[PDB]
Design a protein around this ligand. Structure first.
Ligand SMILES: *[C@@H]1O[C@H](CO)[C@@H](O[C@@H]2O[C@H](CO)[C@@H](O)[C@H](O)[C@H]2NC(C)=O)[C@H](O)[C@H]1NC(C)=O
Ligand SMILES: *[C@@H]1O[C@H](CO)[C@@H](O)[C@H](O)[C@H]1NC(C)=O
Ligand SMILES: [Ca+2]
Ligand SMILES: [Ca+2]
Lengths: 513, 298, 177, 501
C-alpha cells in the first residue's frame, strides 16, 4: 500500500529545571515527546530527561527517617532492632552486622542455604508498554530475620566417585531460603500440553460444454457453434497449535509491610511530593509501570502454524465458425472469458520462553522429544516468570513498610496515567497487514510478518489482504462536563482490511472528572 | 486376552503380639483418651474413620502385580461388481419393388460397483502394582504393547525393589476394640467401641445398595452407592459394555440388610435376612452366609 | 439406571450428656441411600446440643511409679535415658539426660524396611489400610537384631513383635488366550 | 464485536464496624459485585480499609503461657524444649543462654521430601496452595528416626505419619475405527441408424452417465493414564503447632465480624488445611483424531447427430458435464497432563509422543522426591482456631465459619459471564480468565476454526436461600444453556438443594 508520511520526531521545548534537590543535587528537567518519528525520518537526537550537576542550596534531608529502628547509612532502610546482629546483612551497608561483637541469632539451620534461585527475577518491576523487566522493585535478598526454607525438589544431582565406584546423588542444594518478600514459593512441578491440528480441503470442479454444427452442401458451407463454462475451485486450510507450559514453582509476594529494594527506597525518598512529571516518568521508566504480585516460574512453548490457500478459476467461451468452399472461404468468431481469484497465506509462530538461550533456541527451531527433554533440563537451571498477576507501580506505595506516602502515590498515579498514553505504541501509526507497532522509547517500527517491508509492513505480498484493524490512539480527554469526562477512539489505525477483524475493545470510554 | 496375577512376598510374616503386650501409638491413645465414655456414636465413628475397624494381628509384606490386557479387532470387506451389456442390431432391405435399405444397431452398457469396508480395533490394558520403588513401579506398569506382561529385566528389578518398600499384601485381623487400653474407662469404652463397630458395619453395609448389573460390587460410599463394574463394563449400573473372560452366568443373590435385633428375649437376640437383593436368578449362585444370627444379650 | 435421591431419616434421640464436654449429639440414619448417581444426602448426619451433664469427666490415673511421657503415656522407669526413644511421640524419656547415662543400648536402630505398615489399622469394608495404631518401633530396651537374608542387612525388631521373618514366596499366574 | 469488555465492579463500602477492643482498629470492606473480564477495567486493588481507633474497652487477649514465651515470635514452647539442640522458638530464643545443650539426636536426619508443601493451607475452591499454616519444622522432642530406604528422616511433631505406601496403576485404551464406502455406476449407450433408396439418412447417438461416490472415515481414541502413588501422609488430629505467620494473622482478626478481614485471611492462607493426603504423580495422555474423506464424481456426455444425402445436410450436438467434488477433513486433539517429578521428565513426558518405559521409570523415580498431592482429605481452617493459643477462640471460629460461607459465594466463578467456545471461566481474583480448550483461542475463546463445538452447560450461581419452612436454593442453568452448538453432557450436580432452615 501507500506509505504514510515519515513525519519527524518532535519534542516540546525543555521545561525549566527544578531546584537542586538537597541530596542528589541535580537540576531535573523534561521535554515531553509530542510525536515520535513515526517511521524513519529525523529522530530526536537527545535525551528526554536531563539532570545537570549542581551544588545544593541547603542540607540534605534529615538522616533520621525513623526513631529507635536502626537506620542504615547509605540506604534509608529502618530495621527492627532484632535484625541488628542477627548474622545476616539486612542492608547493603552491612551496618547492622559489620560492627557486632556477637549475634543475637545465628540461624545455623538457614544461613547455609542460598536464596531461592530466580527469586530476584520475580522481584523485578515490569514495563507493560515494553514488556521488559525493570529494576528490582522488591528486595530479593532481605530475610527480615525469617529462617524459612523451601524444599528444592530437584536437589537430586547425580555424582560419581571413581574410588568407591559409587554412582549416587549429591545432597547439595536440598533446600533454599525463602526471601522475606515471598508469602509463598511453592516449587510445584506441572506440565500441560494441549495440541489441536485441523485440516480442511475442498475442490469443486465443473466442466460444462456444448458443441454444435449444421452444415449443408449442394458450394459446401458449414456453421458450427460452441458454448462452454469451465470452472475450478479449490480450498485448503491447515491449522495446528501446540502449547506446552511447564510450571516449576508458584509464588506470591507479601502484600503487607513490603520491604522495597534499597535502590527503590532511595529513588522514592528522592521524589518530591510535587508533580514534576520528569522525575516521576523516570521512576516509571526504570522501575517500570507494574510490579509482580503473583505468578509462576516455568517454561512455555507455543507453536502455531496457519496455512490457507484458495484458488478459483472460471473460463467461459462461445464461438461460431463457418465454412464455404467448392477455392475455400473460412470464417469464425466468438467470445473468450477467463476470471481468476487465487490467494495463499502461510503463517508460523514458534516462541519459546524460559530455558537456556541455546536449548530454548533448539526447541524453537526444531521440535522433537530430544529438544523437549533438553529444554526441560534447561528449565531446571533457568526458569522464567511464565504467568503473573501485577499491580501498577504506584500501588506498592500503599503497602510498603514506610507507611502512608499518599501525596507521592497520587502524583505517581497521575504520572503513570500520563506515561501509559504518552509513550504508547498507539502513536506508532498504522502497521498494516497485522504489523506490530512498537515504540522503542523514541523511535517507532512495525514488526512485520514473514514478508516484504518498506515503511509500514505494506509491501508484503498479501493481496489476500484479510488482516485485522487496530485502534487509533485514544483522543485527548474531553473538556469534562463538570464531573463526567469522555474519550473516543476509532478502528482506523489501520482500518480493518477488506473484512479483517474489527478492533475488539472500547470505541468510547468515560471517566468521572 | 492376558491375565497376569502375581505376588512377591518377602516378609514371610509379621506376627504382632496380643493386645496385652502391644504398645499403642501416641495419637491413637490420645484419641481413645478423648472418647466420651458414653455411647456418643459420633466420636467412635470419627475413630473408626481415622483408624478403621481392625488392626493387623499378622500378615506378610510384599508386592502385588496384575496385568489384564485385551486386544479385540474385526475387519470386514464387502465388494460387489455388476455389468450388463446388450446389442440389438437388425437390417431389412428390398430390391423387388423399390431398391431400398434400412439398418439399425443399438448398444447399452450398465456397469455398477459397490465396495464397503469396516474396521474396529480395540486394545485395553491395566497393569497394576503395589510395593517396590516408584520408578520400578512406573517402568513396569507402563504397558509395552509388544510385551504386555512386562519384560523380564524390569520385573526382576521391581521384585528386588519390593524388598525395600514392601506393602502389606496379606493380613489376619483383630477387632480394633481389643486395643482399647491404658485409658480412663477403658473397659467401658471397649464395649462402646464394639457397639460403634457394629453400627458402622451397619451404616456401610453394601446391603443398602440395590444391585449392580453384571456383578458390579455395590459399596456404600458415605450416603450413596457406587457400582465398581467388572472389566470393560461401565455405566451407573454397569448395564453397558461386555464382560471379558468366562462367567458362570445368571444373577447372584445378595443379602438384604439384617432386620433389627429382637431384644434378647429369653436372653437370646435373633435377627433375620432374606437374600432378596437380588433373588438369585438365571442359575446364579445363592448368597453365601446364614439367614439368621442369635447372640447373648449385652 | 434410574438415580435415587438420598433421603435423610429423622434424627435419633440425643446421646446421653457428656460430662467432659457438656454436649449431646443426634444422628440421622440414611433412610434411602443414593443409588445410580442419585443425589447424596446433603449436610451433616449429626447435630450437637449444649447440655448440663449428669456425669463427671473421668480423670486420668497418673503414671504412679512409672515414668510419664509428655503425652501422658507411661513407660517403665528403667527405659529412661536408654538412648532409645520409648516415649512414642515426645521422646521425653530422653530429655535432658546425661551423655554418661545414655547407653550404647543397641549397635543398630534400623527397623525392618516397612515395619511401620504392620502397625496400621485396617478398614474391612473399604479394604483400605488406615492410620497408625500400634507403635511397632517400641524396642523395650532390647538389642533384638535380626539378619534379613533377603535384604542382607541387620534390622532391629521391636520388643513386642512375636516374629518378623524374611523368607520370600513368589506366586505367578500367567493365563494367555 | 461480540465480546465486550466487562469492567470490575465492587460494592459500596460496608459500614465501619465498631472499634475492636484488642486490635484498636476499625474495618470496612467492599464485596466484588462482578469481576473484570475480557480486558475490562480491573477496578482497583485494596477492597478493604482499616483505621486506627481509641478504645476504652478491656481486652483479655493475654492467653496464659505456662511454658517459655519465645522472645521474638512469642510462641509458647514447652519448658522441656529449652536447650534440646532444636530451634523450637524462632531465633533460637529457647537455645540462647543454655548452660548446656542436650542434643536430642546426634545423627543427621532428613525431613520427608515435600513435607513442608503439605503445611501450606489449600484454597479448596480455587484448589490452590497458599501461605503456610502449620509448622512442619517443629519437632518438639522427636528424634525417633524413620528409615525409608537408607535415609533416616525426622518426623515433624505435626505429622501423625508419613509413610511410603508405594503403588502404581497404568490404564491404556486405544480404540480405532475405520469405515469406507465406494460406489460407481457407468451407464452407457449407443444408437446407429441408416437408410437409403437415391437417398441416404444416417442417424447416430451416444450417451454416457458415469457416477462416482466415495466416502472414507477413520477415527482414533487413544487415552493413557499412569497413576503413581509414592507416599501417604496424615496430619495429627489434635494439638497442632501453627505457623508463626498464621498465628499472627489470626491474632490480628477482629472479634466483631468484618468479612473483608477474614476474606484477606483466606486469600493469604486459603480456606482449608490438608489433614490426610496421598502423594504421587499423574501422567495422563489423551489423543482424539477424526479423519473423513469424501469424493463426488459425475460425468455426462451426449452426442446426437444425423446427415442425409440425396446434396448433403448434416446436423449434430455434443453435450458434456464433469462435476467433481472432494471434501476432506482431519481434526486431531491431543492433551497431555503431567503432575510431579523433575522438570526434565515432566517436559519430555509432556511431548506429543507416548514415552519410553525408560522415561516413565526415570519420571516415577523423580516423583518420589518431588511428589504431587494426588488426593487430600481437608478440614476447614477455622478448626485450627483453638482456645490453646487464641483468646475468644469460639468467636474467631464462628466468624471464620461465616466468612468462609460468604467467601465461597464471592469467589465462585459463576459470577463470570459465559465464555464462548466452551470456555471455562476461572475467577483469578477481581478478574476472570476463560481457559479455552484445544482448538479454541482468544480472550473469549471466540477464535475457533472447528465447525461445531459442543457446549457443556455451566450452572448459574445458586439463587439465595429462601426463608424457613423448607429453606431452599435453586439453579437455572441459564448462564451457559448447553443446547447451542449441540450441547454436551448436562451438569451432573444438584439443580436445587433443600435444607431444614
Ligand atoms: C467406469 O468408468 C471408468 C472410466 O473408464 C473406469 O475406470 C477405468 O477402469 C479401467 C479398468 O479398471 C482402468 O484400466 C482405467 O485406467 C480406469 N480409468 C480411470 C480414469 O480411472 C471404471 O472402472 C468404471 N467403473 C465400473 C464399475 O465399471
Ligand atoms: C530437525 O531434527 C531432525 C532430527 O535431528 C532432522 O532430521 C531435521 O532435518 C531437523 N530439521 C531442522 C529444520 O533442523
Ligand atoms: Ca542483620
Ligand atoms: Ca529447643
Amino acid at each position: 500500500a501507500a506509505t504514510p508520511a515519515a513525519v519527524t520526531c518532535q519534542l516540546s521545548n525543555w521545561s525549566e529545571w527544578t531546584d537542586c534537590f538537597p541530596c542528589q543535587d541535580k537540576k531535573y528537567r523534561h521535554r515531553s515527546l509530542l510525536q515520535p518519528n513515526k517511521f524513519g525520518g529525523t529522530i530526536c537526537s537527545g535525551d528526554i530527561w536531563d539532570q545537570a550537576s549542581c551544588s545544593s542550596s541547603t542540607t540534605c534531608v534529615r538522616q533520621a527517617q525513623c526513631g529507635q529502628d536502626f537506620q542504615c547509612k547509605e540506604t534509608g532502610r529502618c530495621l527492627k532492632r532484632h535484625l541488628v546482629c542477627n548474622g545476616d546483612q539486612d542492608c547493603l551497608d552491612g551496618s547492622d552486622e559489620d560492627d557486632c561483637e556477637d549475634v543475637r541469632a545465628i540461624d545455623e539451620d538457614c544461613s547455609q542455604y542460598e536464596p531461592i534461585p530466580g527469586s530476584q527475577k520475580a522481584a523485578l518491576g515490569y514495563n507493560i508498554l515494553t514488556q521488559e523487566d525493570a529494576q528490582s522493585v522488591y528486595d530479593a535478598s532481605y530475610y527480615g530475620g525469617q529462617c524459612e526454607t523451601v524444599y528444592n525438589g530437584e536437589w537430586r544431582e547425580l555424582r560419581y566417585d571413581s574410588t568407591c565406584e559409587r554412582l549416587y546423588y549429591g545432597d547439595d542444594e536440598k533446600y533454599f531460603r525463602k526471601p522475606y518478600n515471598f508469602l509463598k514459593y511453592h516449587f510445584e512441578a506441572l506440565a500441560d500440553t494441549g495440541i489441536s491440528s485441523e485440516f480442511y480441503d475442498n475442490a469443486n470442479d465443473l466442466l460444462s460444454k456444448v458443441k454444435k454444427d449444421k452444415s449443408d452442401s449442394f458450394h459446401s458451407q458449414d456453421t458450427s457453434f460452441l458454448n462452454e463454462l469451465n470452472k475450478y475451485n479449490e480450498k485448503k486450510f491447515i491449522f495446528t497449535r501446540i502449547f506446552t507450559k511447564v510450571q516449576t514453582a508458584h509464588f506470591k509476594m507479601r502484600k503487607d509491610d513490603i520491604m522495597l529494594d534499597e535502590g527503590m527506597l532511595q529513588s522514592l525518598m528522592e521524589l518530591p511530593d510535587q508533580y514534576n512529571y520528569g522525575m516521576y516518568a523516570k521512576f516509571i521508566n526504570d522501575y517500570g509501570t507494574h510490579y509482580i504480585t503473583s505468578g509462576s516460574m516455568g517454561g512455555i512453548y507455543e507453536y502455531i502454524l496457519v496455512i490457507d490457500k484458495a484458488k478459483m478459476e472460471s473460463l467461459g467461451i462461445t464461438s461460431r465458425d463457418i465454412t464455404t468452399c467448392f477455392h475455400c472461404k473460412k470464417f469464425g468468431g466468438g467470445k473468450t472469458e477467463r476470471a481468476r481469484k487465487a490467494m495463499a497465506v502461510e503463517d508460523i509462530i514458534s516462541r519459546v520462553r524460559g530455558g537456556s538461550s541455546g536449548w530454548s533456541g533448539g526447541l524453537a527451531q526444531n521440535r522433537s522429544t530430544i529438544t523437549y527433554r533438553s529444554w526441560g533440563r534447561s528449565l531446571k537451571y533457568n526458569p522464567v516468570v511464565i504467568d503473573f498477576e501485577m499491580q501498577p507501580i504506584h500501588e506498592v506505595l500503599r503497602h510498603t513498610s514506610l507507611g502512608p506516602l499518599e501525596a507521592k502515590r497520587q502524583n505517581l498515579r497521575r504520572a503513570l496515567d500520563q506515561y501509559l498514553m504518552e509513550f504508547n505504541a498507539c502513536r506508532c501509526g498504522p502497521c498494516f497487514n497485522n504489523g506490530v507497532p512498537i515504540l522503542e522509547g523514541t523511535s517507532c517500527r512495525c514488526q512485520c510478518r514473514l514478508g516484504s517491508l518498506g515503511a509500514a509492513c505494506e509491501q508484503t505480498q498479501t493481496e489476500g489482504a484479510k488482516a485485522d484493524g487496530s485502534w487509533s490512539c485514544w483522543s485527548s480527554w474531553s473538556v469534562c462536563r463538570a464531573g463526567i469526562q469522555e474519550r473516543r477512539r476509532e478502528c482506523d489505525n489501520p482500518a480493518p482490511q477488506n473484512g479483517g477483524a474489527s478492533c475488539p475493545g472500547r470505541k468510547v470510554q468515560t471517566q468521572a472528572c | 486376552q492376558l491375565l497376569v496375577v502375581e505376588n512377591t512376598v518377602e516378609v514371610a510374616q509379621f506376627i504382632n503380639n496380643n493386645p496385652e503386650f502391644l504398645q499403642l501409638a501416641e495419637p491413637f491413645w490420645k484419641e481413645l483418651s478423648h472418647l466420651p465414655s458414653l455411647y456418643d456414636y459420633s466420636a467412635y465413628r470419627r475413630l473408626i474413620d481415622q483408624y478403621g475397624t481392625h488392626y493387623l494381628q499378622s500378615g506378610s509384606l510384599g508386592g502385588e502385580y496384575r496385568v489384564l490386557f485385551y486386544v479385540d479387532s474385526e475387519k470386514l470387506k464387502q465388494n460387489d461388481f455388476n455389468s450388463v451389456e446388450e446389442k440389438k442390431c437388425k437390417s431389412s432391405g428390398w430390391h423387388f419393388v423399390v431398391k431400398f435399405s434400412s439398418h439399425g444397431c443399438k448398444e447399452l452398457e450398465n456397469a455398477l460397483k459397490a465396495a464397503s469396508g469396516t474396521q474396529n480395533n480395540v486394545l485395553r490394558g491395566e497393569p497394576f502394582i503395589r510395593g517396590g520403588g516408584a520408578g520400578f513401579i512406573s517402568g513396569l506398569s507402563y504397558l509395552e504393547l509388544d510385551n504386555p506382561a512386562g519384560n523380564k529385566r524390569r520385573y526382576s528389578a521391581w521384585a528386588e525393589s519390593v524388598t525395600n518398600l514392601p506393602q502389606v499384601i496379606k493380613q489376619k485381623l483383630t477387632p480394633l476394640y481389643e486395643l482399647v487400653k491404658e485409658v480412663p474407662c477403658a473397659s467401658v469404652k471397649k464395649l462402646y467401641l464394639k457397639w460403634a463397630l457394629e453400627e458402622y458395619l451397619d451404616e456401610f453395609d453394601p446391603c443398602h445398595c440395590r444391585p449392580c448389573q453384571n456383578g458390579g460390587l455395590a459399596t456404600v460410599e458415605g450416603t450413596h452407592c457406587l457400582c465398581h463394574c467388572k472389566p470393560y463394563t461401565f455405566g451407573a449400573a454397569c448395564e453397558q459394555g461386555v464382560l471379558v473372560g468366562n462367567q458362570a452366568g445368571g444373577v447372584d443373590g445378595g443379602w438384604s440388610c439384617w432386620s433389627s435385633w429382637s431384644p434378647c428375649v429369653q436372653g437370646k437376640k435373633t435377627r433375620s435376612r432374606e437374600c432378596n437383593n437380588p433373588p438369585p436368578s438365571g442359575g446364579g449362585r445363592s448368597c453365601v452366609g446364614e439367614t439368621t444370627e442369635s447372640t447373648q444379650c449385652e | 439406571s434410574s438415580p435415587v435421591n438420598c433421603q435423610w431419616d429423622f434424627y435419633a434421640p440425643w446421646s446421653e450428656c457428656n460430662g467432659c464436654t457438656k454436649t449431646q449429639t443426634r444422628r440421622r440414619s440414611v433412610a434411602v441411600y443414593g443409588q445410580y448417581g442419585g443425589q447424596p444426602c446433603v449436610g451433616n448426619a449429626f447435630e450437637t446440643q449444649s447440655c448440663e451433664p449428669t456425669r463427671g469427666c473421668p480423670t486420668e490415673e497418673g503414671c504412679g511409679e512409672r515414668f510419664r511421657c509428655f503425652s501422658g503415656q507411661c513407660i517403665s522407669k528403667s527405659l529412661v535415658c536408654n538412648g532409645d526413644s520409648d516415649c512414642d511421640e515426645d521422646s521425653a524419656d530422653e530429655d535432658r539426660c546425661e551423655d554418661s547415662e545414655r547407653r550404647p543400648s543397641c549397635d543398630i536402630d534400623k527397623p525392618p524396611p516397612n515395619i511401620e505398615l504392620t502397625g496400621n489399622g485396617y478398614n474391612e469394608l473399604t479394604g483400605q489400610f488406615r492410620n497408625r495404631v500400634i507403635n511397632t518401633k517400641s524396642f523395650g530396651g532390647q538389642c533384638r537384631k535380626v539378619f534379613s537374608g533377603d535384604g542382607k542387612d541387620f534390622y532391629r525388631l521391636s520388643g513386642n513383635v512375636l516374629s518378623y521373618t524374611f523368607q520370600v514366596k513368589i506366586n505367578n499366574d500367567f493365563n494367555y488366550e | 464485536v461480540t465480546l465486550m469488555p466487562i469492567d470490575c465492579e465492587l460494592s459500596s463500602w460496608s459500614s465501619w464496624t465498631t472499634c475492636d477492643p484488642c486490635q484498636k482498629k476499625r474495618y470496612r470492606y467492599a464485596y466484588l459485585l462482578q469481576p473484570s473480564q475480557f480486558h475490562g477495567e480491573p477496578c482497583n486493588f485494596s477492597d478493604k480499609e482499616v483505621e486506627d481507633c481509641v478504645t476504652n474497652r478491656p481486652c483479655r487477649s493475654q492467653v496464659r503461657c505456662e511454658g517459655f514465651v519465645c522472645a521474638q515470635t512469642g510462641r509458647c514452647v514447652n519448658r522441656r524444649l529449652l536447650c534440646n539442640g532444636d530451634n523450637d522458638c524462632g531465633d533460637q530464643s529457647d537455645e540462647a543462654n543454655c548452660r548446656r545443650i542436650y542434643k536430642k539426636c546426634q545423627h543427621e536426619m532428613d525431613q520427608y521430601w515435600g513435607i513442608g508443601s503439605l503445611a501450606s493451607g489449600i484454597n479448596l475452591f480455587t484448589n490452590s496452595f497458599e501461605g503456610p499454616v502449620l509448622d512442619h519444622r517443629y519437632y518438639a522432642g522427636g528424634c525417633s528416626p524413620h528409615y525409608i530406604l537408607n535415609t533416616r528422616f525426622r518426623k515433624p511433631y505435626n505429622v501423625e505419619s508419613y509413610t511410603p505406601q508405594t503403588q502404581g496403576k497404568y490404564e491404556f485404551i486405544l480404540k480405532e475405527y475405520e469405515s469406507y464406502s465406494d460406489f460407481e455406476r457407468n451407464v452407457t449407450e449407443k444408437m446407429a441408424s441408416k437408410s437409403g433408396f437415391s437417398s441416404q439418412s444416417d442417424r447416430g447417438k451416444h450417451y454416457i452417465r458415469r457416477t462416482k461416490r466415495f466416502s472414507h472415515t477413520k477415527s482414533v481414541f487413544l487415552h493413557a493414564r499412569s497413576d503413581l502413588e509414592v507416599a501417604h501422609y496424615k496430619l495429627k488430629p489434635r494439638s497442632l503447632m501453627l505457623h508463626y505467620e498464621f498465628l499472627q494473622r489470626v491474632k490480628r482478626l477482629p472479634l466483631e465480624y468484618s468479612y473483608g478481614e477474614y476474606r484477606d485471611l483466606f486469600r493469604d492462607f486459603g480456606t482449608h488445611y490438608i489433614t490426610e493426603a496421598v502423594l504421587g504423580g499423574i501422567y495422563e495422555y489423551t489423543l482424539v483424531m477424526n479423519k473423513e474423506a469424501m469424493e463426488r464424481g459425475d460425468y455426462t456426455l451426449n452426442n446426437v447427430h444425423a446427415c442425409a444425402k440425396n446434396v448433403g445436410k448434416c446436423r449434430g450436438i455434443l453435450n458434456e458435464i464433469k462435476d467433481r467434488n472432494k471434501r476432506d477433513t482431519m481434526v486431531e486433539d491431543l492433551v497431555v497432563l503431567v503432575r510431579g517429578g523433575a522438570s526434565e521428565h515432566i517436559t519430555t513426558l509432556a511431548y506429543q509422543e507416548l514415552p519410553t518405559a525408560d522415561l516413565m521409570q526415570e519420571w516415577g523415580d523423580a516423583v518420589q522426591y518431588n511428589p504431587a498431592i494426588i488426593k487430600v482429605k481437608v478440614e476447614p481452617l477455622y478448626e485450627l482456631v483453638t482456645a490453646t493459643d487464641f483468646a475468644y477462640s469460639s468467636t474467631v471460629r464462628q466468624n471464620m465459619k461465616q466468612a468462609l460461607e460468604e467467601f465461597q459465594k464471592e469467589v465462585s466463578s459463576c459470577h463470570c459471564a459465559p465464555c464462548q467456545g466452551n470456555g471455562v471461566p476461572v475467577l483469578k481474583g477481581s478478574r476472570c480468565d476463560c481457559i479455552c480448550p484445544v482448538g479454541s483461542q482468544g480472550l473469549a475463546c471466540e477464535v475457533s476454526y472447528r465447525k461445531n463445538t459442543p457446549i457443556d452447560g455451566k450452572w448459574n450461581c445458586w439463587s439465595n436461600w429462601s426463608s424457613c419452612s423448607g429453606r431452599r436454593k435453586t439453579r437455572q442453568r441459564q448462564c451457559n444453556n448447553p443446547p447451542p452448538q449441540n450441547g454436551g453432557s448436562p451438569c451432573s450436580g444438584p439443580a436445587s438443594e433443600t435444607l431444614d432452615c
